[PDB]
Design a protein around this ligand. Sequence first.
Ligand SMILES: Nc1nc2c(ncn2[C@@H]2O[C@H](COP(=O)(O)OP(=O)(O)O)[C@@H](O)[C@H]2O)c(=O)[nH]1
Length: 355
Amino acid sequence: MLAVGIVGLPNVGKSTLFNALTRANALAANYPFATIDKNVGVVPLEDERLYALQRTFAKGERVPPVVPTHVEFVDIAGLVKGAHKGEGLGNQFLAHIREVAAIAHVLRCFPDPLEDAEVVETELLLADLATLERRLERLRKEARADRERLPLLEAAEGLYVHLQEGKPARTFPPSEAVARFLKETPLLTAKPVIYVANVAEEDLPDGRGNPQVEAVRRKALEEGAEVVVVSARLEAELAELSGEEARELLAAYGLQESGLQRLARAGYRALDLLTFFTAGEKEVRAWTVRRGTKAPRAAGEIHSDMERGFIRAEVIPWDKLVEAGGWARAKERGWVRLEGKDYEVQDGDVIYVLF
Ligand SMILES: Nc1nc2c(ncn2[C@@H]2O[C@H](COP(=O)(O)OP(=O)(O)O)[C@@H](O)[C@H]2O)c(=O)[nH]1
């Protein structure tokens, strides 16, 4: 699942954060099928570029509607710390973690958070060490018969040293061999991690001077995780209001973006995603693809057909389309590019597929 799994030990504010997330999910324009699950929802991603494009294509009294994209979050369910005696405690949690692309761990930083982080990390490490032991045995046999498997075996040898020292796969230095191994065997500790420091509202936006948040930032550096500071209670309260009123009251408190939006943006980065747009008089919409996605696959997101039927596409940075004043005007300015099947989409690109 192209989603962020939210985890938390008892009483850290996770259910409160999910009251907010479930409310936000009821605002979505399009729902991924996975959201049928009560534990899966999305947070619409606010993007001012949509409104900028909207003004560019508004004519007379007509204004095209805007459709934002979103980031999917899963409430990871399950007891975390098992006995490892074959009884099965903790198995459901691991199974759920396997299905998400990134992990966001809620840590309580208001009346030890590092202890919670280590508890979860320890269970993920134990599962990964077992996976590595199984792969080392299998790969060593396969490599003797097919040298093409050797790089994965050598990457696994290195990761095993790293994990045996209690370090996550995500902080192991990158290399071609490690990349091939992790694509085939997606270790739990290789998933990007966001530590969500839950604080009292007075500590927003960065938990400055809050020793618990500072300790979380220190641990994050060691674990290769990013940090987002939110007040779950505040987010739940704001989510009950209209977006306009919530923004005004937030600004009155000297805060410029909700914690849910900050979390959504952190999740977007963790999942290595980028936004591209389709824009015209009828509609302006934001689409999401993984960084590295080429024009054809991008086109496939808009219309399945277009991927195979893809011949070429007009592409222009949203800011240049806005600066020009429209498609006809951007063409005249020579700012509209015709890109082929080899083109890697860039964040902010506006695309119109030919055929
Ligand atoms: N002051 C304050 N209290 C919070 C915040 N988030 C959660 N709480 C309170 O902390 C307790 C546990 O929150 P909860 O969502 O039930 O934790 P869970 O066990 O991780 O779901 C509750 O009584 C919540 O009201 C927050 O951001 N600020």
